[PDB]
TrEMBL record:
It comes from the Bacteria. The gene is pilO. This is Type IV pilus biosynthesis protein. It comes from Burkholderia pseudomallei (strain K96243). The chain holds residues 1 to 192 of 432 of the full protein.
Amino acid sequence: YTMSAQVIQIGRQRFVGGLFWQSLSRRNELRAEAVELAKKLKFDLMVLRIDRGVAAAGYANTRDGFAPGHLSLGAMVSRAIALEGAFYNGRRQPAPNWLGAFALPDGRWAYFAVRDHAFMPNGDWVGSREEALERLHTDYAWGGWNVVIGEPELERQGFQNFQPKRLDDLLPRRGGRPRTERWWALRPVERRLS
Ligand SMILES: [K+]
Ligand SMILES: [K+]
Ligand SMILES: [K+]
Ligand SMILES: [K+]
Ligand SMILES: [K+]
């Protein structure tokens, strides 16, 4: 019972970071494949991230402090960036390869790393500002990134292509009111009886 997950309260919405991300084959019904992989990888909770650019599952375990109904912060940010792209190499365009770090309302930071529109396996992390920046710089060294998207203060880091962005800018809304999309929610991975 590691209980490493701590909910992120953003207004009325309860988000989580730290899912394990698994790209799917695209050869089988995506949900059924995701369920099979969850059993093998030993996770009892999942979210599906599906659109024209991605077919992936984000996984967690109840024993690690995650729960059905927790909203995937990664799912939200991933889709938001899929929708708006980013400015890099002289134009606003889709950004398949992006990294970012965002300040959270309680002082923690979220770190994201996405390649070919899909999260890297551990590219969804929440913790201290210092460790988030450390992870950011570490993945950045690999190269092949379109853009760094995140907290405006990261301007100062001197990344080649930087896109300032706050989580608040990305949340979908009803006028001023944040909307929750149901698909962000972790749901139980159904298992047959033995
Ligand atoms: K994976
Ligand atoms: K796979
Ligand atoms: K494949
Ligand atoms: K997440
Ligand atoms: K995406």
